[PDB]
Amino acid sequence: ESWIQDPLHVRPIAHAIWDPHFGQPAVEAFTRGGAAGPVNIAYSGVYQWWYTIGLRTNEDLYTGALFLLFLSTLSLIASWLHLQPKWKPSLSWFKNAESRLNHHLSGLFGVSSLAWTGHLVHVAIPASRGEYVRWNNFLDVLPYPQGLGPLLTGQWNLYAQNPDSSNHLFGTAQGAGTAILTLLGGFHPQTQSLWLTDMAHHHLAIAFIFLIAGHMYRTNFGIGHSIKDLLEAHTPPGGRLGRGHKGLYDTINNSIHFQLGLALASLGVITSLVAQHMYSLPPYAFIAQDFTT
Amino acid sequence: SLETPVTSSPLVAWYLSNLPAYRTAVSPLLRGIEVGLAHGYLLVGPFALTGPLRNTPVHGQAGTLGAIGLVSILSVCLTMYGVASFNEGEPSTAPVLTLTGRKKEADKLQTAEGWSQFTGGFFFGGVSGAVWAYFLLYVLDLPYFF
Amino acid sequence: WVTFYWHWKHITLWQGNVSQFNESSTYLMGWLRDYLWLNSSQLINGYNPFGMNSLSVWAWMFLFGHLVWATGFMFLISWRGYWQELIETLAWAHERTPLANLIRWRDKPVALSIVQARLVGLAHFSVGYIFTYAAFLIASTSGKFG
Amino acid sequence: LQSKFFNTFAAPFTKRGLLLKFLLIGGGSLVAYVSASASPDLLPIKKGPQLPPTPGPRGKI
């Protein structure tokens, strides 16, 4: 709560120190950040990320703790549940490579990105304009004073009308525009981060690509490609690639160590991609001046 | 092995053969309480005199608390061994043959029931030994170098 | 070589001293003098015979990084057959010491396997290599916060 | 005489199942009790600093 009041002069605090080997001059030394005893300064940059995405007090965090704690409890149930008989999937269920790629592409990657757009324009963006929206009242407030219309008509050209002014203070209403989806591309002048209204648009844009990319493969309804067929069909004439991709369907779809290899390779790249983009295009407010973070 | 002076001699073979661990013909409860007496009264020194409170007037009562715990931990480390190295109804694993060749009784200590008796001897002796140091060293406390 | 490059280029930028990288970064002694040696002045003073600072914990971890890393070599260089002959002598000494032949290993002691040593040796090398750099990265930057 | 005096006064601590429970549970309670009720003048952490805080570089951040 204090760090919010001045992000550039209050060391974020990670936790408290209680080590009964500490002597007295250490107890003094590690007391900082405006605490009462020794503490550790948080360098994981959580403080800025939760500022941006709309959290504002301690109390939001406590329910944030409980909810995730509940989600953890739910998962532990599932790991037990799917070992008993009459709840364990058969082989053919796991080896269904088509029906899985539809859901993962359209449901997992897809809807989640659409819903995160929902949170950005129902809580986050309103937070950065002085509006405190929570589960108590989020039915009264309108994301855009004419909301839910302009989209139905077809003149979506209103949600980018009047964006945040150049002279904006991140936590209050000065210069606060009313646009929710924009395309500005610059930096927020005060906080040296990407604009909120761009990031809402981008998660909305790629919320569509995956949804439409999700209906490719055939599951039960007689339309859509067969991944076995696509591999066979791509056999170059002239023989330079031999029999081409014939038979790679079974070899992948029967070797776990193959599937894991591909997953790691793709995951290995984008993590480097994440590292390269974050430091150039700071996506969280007041994180380009916390040099250590 | 080899018979050197150290491994065999009247003085050596009388010293070892008459301390509780080797008096194979007495009850393992007492063999536990002697052992805990000598060890317990032993280590009260370094905790009290070299601990982190030696300067403070609680050096007497901070060493004793330290030694008391260490006896308790070894009591656990004793019980873990007894419960994992013997079975409740299996006989003794001690050698039953003396050097002369007389086949003597197997030691009761090397037995689940015996060892559980022995640790009862060690623990009670360990705390009793470590208080007896504290009483002497801070009541009858003149001559010592403390 | 990647994180080194990112840190030094930025640590000169944040101070507004961008000339220092652009000249020293063409010869190796520039990297050793102007980045390693120079920027670790505040870290190593985490605790000295004059006093301590907030940076002491990072100074301690810094050496702790050097220690695990240097233990890594022990498992990579010295291979198994030497240690196995060393255990056998030890497992003889324990079997002949009086008062200590009363305690018997349940699982016989052997030196680590050939693959295990490589894995263990690499575990130390990696852990020591992360902790060392992670301490220098945080302390040096946070020392100046710029 | 020492045999009989010792033999009866160490019997409760002998059954290895019970000795293991009381050692950990009782001990774990005692460790809890000693630290939660130690004097602040023998544990530096248990007392606060009670001294002014030194600001960090670049203001307080």
């Binding site: 408290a16 209680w18 | 994992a84 | - | 809890a32 630290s35």
Partner: peptide
């Protein structure tokens, strides 16, 4: 207050019971 109890429990007791619990399980025989 609360740290002074929970730090020892996870630092001293919870390790001890853990090590002694595994040691029996590892060294069992059936």
């Amino acid at each position: 207050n609360l740290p002074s109890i929970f730090v020892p429990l996870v630092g001293l007791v919870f390790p001890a019971i853990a090590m002694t619990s595994l040691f029996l399980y590892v060294q069992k025989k059936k």
